[PDB]
Structure 1
Amino acid sequence: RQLHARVDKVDEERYDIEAKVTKNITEIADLTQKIFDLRGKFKRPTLRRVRISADAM
């Protein structure tokens, strides 16, 4: 029964570390999302194939 209480509380605790790393991952997602914004400001203008049909004809 000590084990039953242990598994109750430790199930709780592993679910809790679950939610904690879940918040870590959610904030990785959101902060890295605003960081996608930050670095996109810098890198999007070149995601393009340019100066191909300029001369070939």
Structure 2
Amino acid sequence: SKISASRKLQLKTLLLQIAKQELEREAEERRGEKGRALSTRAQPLELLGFAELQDLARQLHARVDKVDEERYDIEAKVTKNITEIADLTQKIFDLSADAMMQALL
């Protein structure tokens, strides 16, 4: 080989060493992406008039019934993906020293 296997192994270890860091960096990006998507989709509450304070609480109640349906529709898509992933993965799978050194020397 053109290089030593000790260097070949040292480089392989440093490739995963940053690929992990890019994953945690990706998680921090996804954490910030969520908070921004939550300040847009869930504008926090702030106050009212006891009469026309209610028609917003009515509007919130109707929102929950729609949000959970949107959450279900994306969940059922993730659910069906899990079925196909396990189905696809099923298809492809088919295709001592230290105790000696002391008892010797």
Q: TM-score, normalised by structure 2?
A: 0.37
Q: What SS does structure 1 have at the residue aligned with 2:53?
A: helix
Aligned-residue CA RMSD (Å): 1.9
For residue 75 of structure 2, the aligned residue among 25, 29, 35 is 25
Q: What SS does structure 2 have at the residue aligned with 1:2?
A: coil
Residues in 1 aligned to 2:83 and 2:57: alpha-carbon distance in whole angstroms: 37
Provide runs of 4+ in structure 1 moved above 6 Å.
Answer: none
For structure 1, the 5+ residue unaligned runs are 46-57
Q: Taking every aligned residue pair, what percent have the same amino acid on both sides?
A: 11
What is the number of residues matched between the two proteins?
A: 45
For structure 2, the 5+ residue unaligned runs are 1-50, 96-105
Query: 1:16 offset after TM fit, Å?
Result: 1.1
Between structure 1 and structure 2, the one with the greater Rg is 2
